[PDB]
């Protein structure tokens, strides 16, 4: 019995083409170039899934020592002094948000400045 490709190739192909969506030019309408684009897209995906966590670490750090310098401290100094004070163990995420609620971050700064004199 013969068993020609029939329905199968078109269906895998459409699966890739639908992954394409807003890909510029042939990247979204010709199969081979869509497939190949998605190879490099795999690369980018997995590695960024890692990276985003370095990213938000960086951003919270920026904001935290921005607030720390608002009061005459700095990230090195404020983070250490908080660490010295019965280990606060707030995440760097959480210290930022208290850089959206200044009256508290202030007291955290005075507390870090304490366990440090």
């Amino acid at each position: 019995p013969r068993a020609k490709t029939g329905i199968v190739r078109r269906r895998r192909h459409k699966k890739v083409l639908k992954r394409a969506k807003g890909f510029w030019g042939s990247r979204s309408k010709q199969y081979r170039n869509a497939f190949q684009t998605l190879l490099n897209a795999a690369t980018y995906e997995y590695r960024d899934r890692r990276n985003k966590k370095r990213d938000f670490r960086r951003l919270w750090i920026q904001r935290i020592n921005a607030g720390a310098r608002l009061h005459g401290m700095n990230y090195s100094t404020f983070i250490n002094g908080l660490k010295r004070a019965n280990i606060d163990l707030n995440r760097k995420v959480l210290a930022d948000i208290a850089a959206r609620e200044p009256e508290a971050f202030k007291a955290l700064v005075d507390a870090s400045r304490n366990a440090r004199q």
Binding site: L59, I64, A66, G67, R69, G72, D96, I97, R100
Partner: protein, 143 residues
């Protein structure tokens, strides 16, 4: 879930430059313009400040630098361009000196160029932006 501010704020500031080493006043201006000060919130947004450098003519250039510093620039022409100016030829246009330092210490991208818009340099002790009454700054932080 991290906070992402909207930025109605415009923030004018008046940095004096007399006697400040150029790179140092530069770094302070570049930081204040890029954000940094205050919780930076989004890198995505140009939420930094407008700086109004004055007395840019009086910038100190500690060391031999006043006549060693050779700013260099290249015209498209393959006749030898690369013209060079002494920085003692800040007499030709002192704001360029300041404006060059700062743009070096700014990002080079689309948003960075857009940031250069926020620098206003005047070699004299005067400026026309009275309508924004800038806050004075000092020049250096303390431990």
């Amino acid at each position: 879930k991290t906070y992402i501010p909207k930025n109605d704020e415009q923030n004018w500031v008046v940095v004096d430059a007399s006697g400040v080493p150029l790179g140092r006043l530069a770094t302070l201006i570049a930081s204040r313009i890029r954000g940094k000060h205050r919780p930076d919130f989004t890198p995505n947004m140009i939420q930094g400040d407008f700086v109004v450098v004055i007395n840019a003519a009086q910038v100190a250039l500690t060391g031999k630098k006043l006549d060693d510093k050779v700013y260099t620039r290249y015209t498209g022409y393959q006749g030898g361009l690369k013209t060079e100016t002494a920085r003692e030829a800040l007499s030709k246009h002192p704001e360029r000196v300041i404006e060059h330092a700062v743009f070096g210490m700014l990002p080079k991208g689309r948003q960075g160029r857009a940031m250069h818009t926020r620098l206003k340099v005047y070699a004299g002790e005067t400026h026309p932006h009275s309508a924004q009454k800038p806050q004075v700054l000092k020049t250096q932080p303390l431990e």
